[PDB]
Amino acid sequence: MEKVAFIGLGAMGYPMAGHLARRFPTLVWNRTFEKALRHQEEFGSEAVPLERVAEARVIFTCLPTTREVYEVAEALYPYLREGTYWVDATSGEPEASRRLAERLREKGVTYLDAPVSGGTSGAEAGTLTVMLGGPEEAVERVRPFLAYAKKVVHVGPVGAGHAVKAINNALLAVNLWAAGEGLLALVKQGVSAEKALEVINASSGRSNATENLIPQRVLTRAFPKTFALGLLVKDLGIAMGVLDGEKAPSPLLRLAREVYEMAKRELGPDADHVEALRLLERWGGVEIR
Amino acid sequence: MEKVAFIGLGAMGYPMAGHLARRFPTLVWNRTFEKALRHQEEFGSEAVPLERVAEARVIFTCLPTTREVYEVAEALYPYLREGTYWVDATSGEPEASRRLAERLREKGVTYLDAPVSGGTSGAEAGTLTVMLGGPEEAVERVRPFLAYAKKVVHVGPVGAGHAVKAINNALLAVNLWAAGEGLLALVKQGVSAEKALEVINASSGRSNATENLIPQRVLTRAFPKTFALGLLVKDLGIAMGVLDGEKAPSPLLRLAREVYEMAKRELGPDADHVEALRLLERWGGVEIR
Amino acid sequence: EKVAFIGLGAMGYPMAGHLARRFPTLVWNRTFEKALRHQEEFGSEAVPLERVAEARVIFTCLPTTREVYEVAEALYPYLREGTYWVDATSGEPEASRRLAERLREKGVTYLDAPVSGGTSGAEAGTLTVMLGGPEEAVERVRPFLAYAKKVVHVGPVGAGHAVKAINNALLAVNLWAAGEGLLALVKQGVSAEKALEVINASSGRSNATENLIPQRVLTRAFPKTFALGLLVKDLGIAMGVLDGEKAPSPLLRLAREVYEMAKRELGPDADHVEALRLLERWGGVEIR
């Protein structure tokens, strides 16, 4: 027999747990339990009280922040069995996560930070990129269970995964915002946004941002909700913590956190992350399309 | 075929004019006569004094800046004939170019800004990406003559081509520098720059910078010279002029010009643009690799 | 000798009042009612624009060099040789240099003479003046600056405007940075009153923390004395000064962009100090 479990059935967790459920007997739990019941009916997982999650050989979590991961770890602490692996797909904090790992080790549980990239489309397709942090033996053991992933890279000990994820998202943030500033200026003087992007995406200034986010969500005015702006700002905050390690001159990334915070304050934490460009459109008095 | 003429036989112009020569009777001009004679002997073009360039149906220019384009336009003015087209491959200044376009229009000469991307490699291969600015009809008329290009995009009226070229390079600048800041922080905390990029290039933070510039030129320490840092700062200057049109809040792009200026002053204008990252390495006390 | 003042705005109205008490003063204003009002209040003489040419010294305090150029072109046909044009407008160095050339065609000597001290300074007649132009002309005009106290000759035509632009760029930075810091302190329970009491007796003090924030922000009064739109205009001129050498200027460059944000959200007619309300809106708290 086999048994894994998933906690946190959100935008990412719901589809991620679906891949797990189709492959292994999977127990799922969600604060708003209705979501777990729906998941059971849709994928064949089994909705259970949080405590039963401790029955699994591999526990997965995809929560907002390390804060929530801590809460559920403390709730499960007395029931955790020796030999269990904890795969945290939360975009967490390196330091607080190293502490959590030490704490879980008290029960013989091996924590591995395993944040992902690829968004909800990647979660649904099961092609998420995973950046793992932790012991080499543990990493080898968990690979087969990552049913929702394609590219899996072991980047270092506990905390390195979250650190890499944070920096990756800070780069996405910077690339996206800069492209927004440039497109705003271009559109303002009669340049076709679509044609400009075709050029840019064939040139040196191309990025995932100009290739797969702006054309699809901004020019169309679709602005689909897939990744909360509040969560990206939270990621930028974690990236700032990574920069604090050595504090080498990092003018561009530091500022990136501040402009996205402006967007969060004006648009709300629940707007989609790409909607941050709407702030530039508001100031400019013109839409990017 | 109709006669064409190319002005400016530099690293880009020499090969570009070579592609034209293989298809049409081609007149070539270069400040330094030797280069034109060399081109004539190699491709069968015909080296001529500037004034004879007016014999062409289509005049092409690829000079350092709009200032040089102005100088040659001024000298040719008394000889320009109605029905002529002027394709400017120079990475020019949008506004100054629009003014030039009007003076040329008065002689019955239709100007189109047509900056290019793809570098000397693309010029040699004849696969350059062209961003055209100008009247629809004129664009239709000149497409058949762009023998050195593959992808040809009409981005807007006169000046739009130059604007997109400038903004593209500004985006490249930001993407590259930000990636430098983040990778520096990661390398400093023990994470392999190679491992970090493996994840990033398969994640949302990816860009041409992280995909094709940093791994090949920075991690390898090769730093091949393809585009001078001093020239990138110059393009950033043109990009700042584009931002000045509306002056909508553009903190990120504005800051980008300033940090690259720092690199230009400490590393020298002749260092390669990617070497700008050496400044981060110097401050960081560690190499990105 | 006779003098004249063009542009009776927030600064011009009181500035011309000081001239009127010392010299026969002719005044003109686009919205002529202000000139008539000025005549009744100070004893100056409201006159048609062309009559301004009667003066030995012409003063202007308009929004930008563009408006100064407009009135100069209008007066061109009437200007007399030997006349002086003292421009209190916060103008552009280059355009002003071209204006000086145009005016020399009529034998008129232009000098940029932008000021600092605000409307309170204009009313008190204690304005600081930064002059740009020939030293012979500077010496001839000094006696006429009845609305000024500290007067400094900083260089040739255009130098005064450049210094004013940089001065205001510093004011903007000091003001905004102070805002970001006070906001943070207020958020964690430290009153802006106590914080400023310390700051104004410490190394972080500036004219902004001493004479602007306590009086306009903590009181919630936000009086309108200097348009935010004009300060953004000044920052634009400062960016032009930075473009001369383009040496790394990250802080000043960023300053123009954040004040532009304030302008877009609060409007150009808000007071310059109201820029801090954008910080209050984002922070969800008042700086008090």
Next chain:
Amino acid sequence: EKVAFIGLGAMGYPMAGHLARRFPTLVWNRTFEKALRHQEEFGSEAVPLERVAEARVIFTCLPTTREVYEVAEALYPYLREGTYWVDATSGEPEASRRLAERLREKGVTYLDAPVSGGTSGAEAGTLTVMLGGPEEAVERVRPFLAYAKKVVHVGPVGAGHAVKAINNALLAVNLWAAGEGLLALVKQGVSAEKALEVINASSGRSNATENLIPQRVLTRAFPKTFALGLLVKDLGIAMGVLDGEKAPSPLLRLAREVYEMAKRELGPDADHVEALRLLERWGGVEIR
């Protein structure tokens, strides 16, 4: 009542001098020679670190909270109930709150009391003090602040450090922005001397342009009184204060980064004002 001082540095040495001139003072320094020198000069008494616990009020002025904590742990087993700990170190609010709790275990009341006024202010005994802590404790220690003039109670433990950090961040921004502006002006032929004469009589004036730049930069004197490394440390603390609410603070955030550049290139041991030299190196001209 007896007092004691730990950390006879650029600030500590003179500060403890003012104390020794009014109260029985015990002094200690890592490099004991300084303590002996102080004893000979002011009449204080150099003693082993452990003897400091004999004082009613213990004063410290070390590099960072890290050192204060280290000295605290060493003294912990000897601390007496009823003692007060006045920390003049420019410390971290959070770590200082933890330190206060630790000291409370021995019945010792900690108060953050960072200062402003530099070495000249310490020598003159006119330092501004920003106190964080219990009201009753503040009243008890006020009479012992012999090296201060203006003393403000800004909040509970940690608030003093928070205000100092923000104050210094404003100083840093004011200083650097002034550098960027003056550099541009000098490059176009305008004397920094003339520019500052105008600025210090205008809206852009600050303690930085009034008392640091003219005296240290224009003269090329660049005296060493406050390490660049310590200012960057203060900026780092300021960033931590900003992290409380994380309201948009682009200017102050950028300030930490440019001063870091100066530290990397000039070294943490250069004077804080020497940061402007980075601008001079890039600009290729001296600010005069």
